[PDB]
């Protein structure tokens, strides 16, 4: 039930279109509630079948539940056609084309915090013991210049991004997040690159049997490459838990700001 949180039509103000989500469009609008605030709302598509709004209102249901700085909030729902979530604004948009305009005004610690950031929230989830299943989805919304989040929206599987496992089995477990992390760490240190540039998705999975990795990244500290590496391991019981990466992280970043 939704009604802790439903939301009256007339105190949203619709605006531009800034985005896509799985079911349909991204808006940015104002919402007068405290104050005439700024927000995301998800719309969506064909919600004139039942099917799709049980799916598309499940998002919203999900988000609900879970409450940290980086991970994107849920502010409500307007559960009459059409149907609307409203989320809070991430302002600067998505972190890969974030970090490729801001590639010569981003320091490494901001890099290194980005990082960290979202392993905080990764652990909360595992905490949590949340399984998401919607890998397509995944991507990284930014807050603020020193606040990343996750979301299921931008503003066909990832096969470059995940484990053999699964790519071989399906196999979808707290260590497969984990291989997927390691390659958004490596991306945000590539300055928003995407993995294997040129490089076919079936040739992937032989490429990555053969031992080869993503390489370090130019000006990536070697503590935090073995770090990636480790997340890396193709027996999925050697990769470090979350909570082992937080903590990790941590103490890299205090590194990096101590010089
Ligand atoms: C609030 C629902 C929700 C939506 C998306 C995610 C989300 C977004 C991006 C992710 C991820 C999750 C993600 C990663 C690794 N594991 N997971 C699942 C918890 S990731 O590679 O950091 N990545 C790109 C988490 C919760």
New binding site residues.
Partial sequence: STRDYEIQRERIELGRCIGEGQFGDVHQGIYMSNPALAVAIKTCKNCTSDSVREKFLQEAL??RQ?DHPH??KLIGVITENPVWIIMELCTLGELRSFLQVRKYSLDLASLILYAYQ?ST??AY?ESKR?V?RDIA????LVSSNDCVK???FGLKLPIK?MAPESINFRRFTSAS??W??G??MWEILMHGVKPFQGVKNNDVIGRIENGERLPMPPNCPPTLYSLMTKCWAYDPSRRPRFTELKAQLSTILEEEKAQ
């Avoid at 989805?137 to 990284?140: E, F, K, L, T």
């Fill in positions: 999900t988000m879970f991970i994107v979202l929230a990764l989830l949340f998401h989805a995944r991507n990284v996750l979301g299921d991004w997040d984990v997927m992390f390659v958004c």
